[PDB]
Design a protein around this ligand. Structure first.
Ligand SMILES: Nc1cccc(-c2cnc3[nH]cc(-c4cccnc4)c3c2)c1
Length: 344
């Protein structure tokens, strides 16, 4: 009947009551998101005197444990990150309230999935896409400092928030499914739309997986829609092969899951496998035409606008193709990304 003295519901989640004060400190405004992890409320802090977002974790051991890993990793980033200038969302403090791990974060404006939706899935300025990329490149650079070596493992529009609603300064969230570099524990990682070939094929993954995600994320912020929107892993791979071609032989020869999507022919090469129930041939929907670098941008709608010339679109195709490199070792890394001619 009543679980945890009637504070929790059937899903072990704390039932939110708008107005309820905690610990003569936090004043709960409302609920704003939920997830697997638990819930995220809006709440004023009277000691510091600001709005904060408190991530309420579910009163259950499995969720308490992985939230505890995340708290470790965030605190660890706050040791390096001194002047909040590497675009990570700040963990402020954490406490136990009524048998729930609560994480207090800095409060932020809507995520980039909301921003995309507010333009009815038709994207925003190349000018803004450059600002977001620069900011996200440095955040990655920071994650790749050797002491950290933190892989987010889940970058999508959903996990990138704006600081101010009238300013382009962003941050990253959701390190709850995010590990450090090391021996391979999981295989089924990342959101499908933004999952890399090394993962789909089931090979050793390192910090380059987040760079693939970003690569997919930036195109979506300018076009409006996902670059690769696969129903399942078989569709996803095929949709990558629509654009980037069949992956190189030496990578497919190594891949454990290379027969889920391909077949090795009698003459050494790899071909696609036919399916249940119409794609384009490998590498024939070229990003040049997806972005529309000669046709006034994504579906013509940027023709004539400042900073959307063939000159500017070519720099943005070059970096994006360089991020979407099939090979995790030659793929571009954040220190060279920032050097690229696109941020000039
Ligand atoms: N209104 C709204 C919509 C989407 C995200 C947020 C928001 C604002 N600030 C935040 N700080 C930390 C989070 C957050 C995000 C994901 C999981 N747990 C906390 C967080 C979320 C707020």
């Amino acid at each position: 009947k009543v679980y945890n003295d009637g504070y929790d519901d059937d899903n072990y989640d704390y039932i939110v009551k708008n107005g309820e004060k905690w610990m003569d400190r936090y004043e709960i405004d409302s609920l704003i998101g939920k997830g697997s992890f638990g819930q995220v409320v809006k709440a004023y802090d009277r000691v510091e005197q600001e709005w904060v977002a408190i991530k309420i974790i579910k009163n259950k051991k499995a969720f308490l444990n992985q939230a505890q890993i995340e708290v470790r990793l965030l605190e660890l980033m706050n040791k390096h990150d001194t002047e909040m200038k590497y675009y990570i969302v700040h963990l402020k403090r954490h406490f136990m309230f009524r048998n729930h791990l609560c994480l207090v974060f800095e409060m932020l404006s809507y995520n980039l999935y909301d921003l995309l939706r507010n333009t009815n899935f038709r994207g925003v300025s190349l000018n803004l896409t450059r600002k977001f990329a620069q900011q996200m490149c440095t955040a990655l650079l920071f994650l790749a400092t050797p002491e950290l070596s933190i892989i987010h493992c889940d970058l999508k529009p959903e996990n990138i928030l704006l600081c101010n609603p009238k300013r382009s300064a962003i941050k990253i969230v959701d390190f709850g499914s995010s590990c450090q570099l090391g021996q391979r524990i999981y295989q089924y990682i990342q959101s499908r739309f933004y999952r890399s070939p090394e993962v789909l094929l089931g090979m050793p993954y390192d910090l380059a997986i987040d760079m693939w995600s970003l690569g997919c994320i930036l195109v979506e912020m300018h076009t409006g829609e996902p670059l690769f929107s696969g129903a399942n892993e078989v569709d996803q791979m095929n949709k990558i092969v629509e654009v980037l071609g069949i992956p190189p032989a030496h990578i497919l020869d190594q891949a454990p899951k290379a027969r889920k999507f391909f077949e090795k022919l009698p003459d050494g090469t790899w071909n696609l496998k036919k399916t249940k129930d119409e794609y384009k041939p490998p590498g024939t929907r070229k990003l040049h035409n997806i972005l529309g670098v000669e046709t006034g941008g994504p579906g013509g709608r940027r023709a004539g606008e400042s900073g959307h010339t063939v000159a500017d679109y070519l720099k943005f195709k070059d970096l994006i193709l360089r991020m979407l490199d099939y090979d995790p070792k030659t793929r571009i890394q954040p220190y060279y990304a920032l050097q690229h001619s696109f941020f000039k």
